[PDB]
Amino acid sequence: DLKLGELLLQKGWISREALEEALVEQEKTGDLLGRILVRKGLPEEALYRALAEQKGLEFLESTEGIVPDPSAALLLLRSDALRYGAVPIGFQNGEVEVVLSDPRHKEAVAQLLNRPARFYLALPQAWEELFRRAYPQ
Amino acid sequence: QKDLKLGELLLQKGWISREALEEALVEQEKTGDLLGRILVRKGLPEEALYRALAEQKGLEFLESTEGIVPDPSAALLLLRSDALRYGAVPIGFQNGEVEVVLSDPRHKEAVAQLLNRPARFYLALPQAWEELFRRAYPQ
Ligand SMILES: Nc1nc2c(ncn2[C@@H]2O[C@@H]3COP(=O)(O)O[C@H]4[C@@H](O)[C@H](n5cnc6c(=O)[nH]c(N)nc65)O[C@@H]4COP(=O)(O)O[C@H]3[C@H]2O)c(=O)[nH]1
Ligand SMILES: Nc1nc2c(ncn2[C@@H]2O[C@@H]3COP(=O)(O)O[C@H]4[C@@H](O)[C@H](n5cnc6c(=O)[nH]c(N)nc65)O[C@@H]4COP(=O)(O)O[C@H]3[C@H]2O)c(=O)[nH]1
């Protein structure tokens, strides 16, 4: 499995020197590598596609057409949906479809859901819009 | 940003190296291929090409067309044959401008002259463009 910097280097979004400079910057700042690269010109959508590939998620370019199934939303308390950044939106072939806000949360969410699931990843605004739709207050 | 060449823009953005751009331009010297086509074939992400080309012609790059509900009244402003020939899908209206999604930034001027009215242009990747076209203009 590839690290994020290598995935992006291979794709050609960043240069070798750019990756080295970002890693050197991270040694002093503690920032996530992805945030540094985005600040230096990596599109956020390109970052998220690479992070999705690294964790076996499907990146969703848009959430606007999703109609959240209330039956699926039942599988997480709203408080858990927010804290874990996970919106169950529906079912497909006996799996619950779940949209994550952060690929790092895949494992924690999957363990908790404890059932076959298909994981998606969405950018922060599209995720928030989808979350409010599925879990209205 | 509208005054820079494609290579310069990609260099400025950190998406191409000076070496890669030199190679591509020298090969174009012999082949006459479109420059972005050469760069992509040598490994430039197609989306990096489209983002730079969008900046160059003042177009808004669309990461996705899947959330667009094409307004049938805007689609009337182009015959289907023109929509496909010019690679332009009129999708709606905002503030008295028509919103138009292009498949190729090089066609912006020809579409603008034809529409003859205030317009807001977008650029979408080929697959995303074709999907939107077929929705706005079923056969
Ligand atoms: N939601 C979100 N998640 C992000 C972001 N950036 C990175 N991640 C994810 O969070 C994990 C920790 O990244 P890190 O703090 O930068 O720590 C990274 C980084 O310090 C470092 N390193 C990362 N990439 C490379 C590389 O290409 N070459 C070398 N030599 N070291 C790398 O290894 C550590 C683990 O790398 P990864 O396996 O890829 O695991 C990454 C990656 O899965 C972001 O902006 N947003
Ligand atoms: N849909 C689409 N459009 C594309 C593509 N590649 C380039 N274009 C666009 O089409 C125009 C013609 O580019 P070209 O035939 O390769 O002709 C180019 C190229 O031969 C050359 N040249 C291009 N970039 C550079 C550069 O950075 N430095 C130098 N010295 N010469 C360049 O100057 C000419 C004008 O360049 P531009 O102003 O950028 O104008 C470009 C650019 O707007 C593509 O792959 N797909």
Numbering used by the authors:
A (entry chain B): 165 to 301
B (entry chain A): 163 to 301
Reported in the publication:
Interestingly, we find that PilF binds only two molecules of c-di-GMP with different affinities and that the c-di-GMP–binding activities can be attributed to the GSPII-B and GSPII-C domains. Remarkably, the GSPII-B domain binds c-di-GMP with a KD of only 6 nM and thus with an affinity ∼ 83fold higher than MshEN.
The crystals diffracted to ∼2 Å and the protein chain could be traced without interruption from residue 165 to 301 with c-di-GMP fitting perfectly into the difference electron density. The N-terminal subdomain spans residues 167 to 221 and consists of a tightly packed four helix bundle in which helix α1 and α2 as well as α3 and α4 are parallel to each other. The C-terminal subdomain exhibits a fold in which a mixed four-stranded β-sheet at the core of the subdomain is surrounded by four helices and the inflexible linker. The 10 direct intermolecular hydrogen bonds identified between the N-terminal subdomain of PilF159-302 and c-di-GMP are all conserved in comparison to the intermolecular hydrogen bonds described for MshEN, highlighting the importance of these conserved residues for the MshEN-like c-di-GMP–binding mode. Inspection of the presented X-ray and NMR-structures of PilF159-302 in complex with c-di-GMP shows that these two residues are involved in extensive hydrophobic stacking interactions with the two guanine bases.
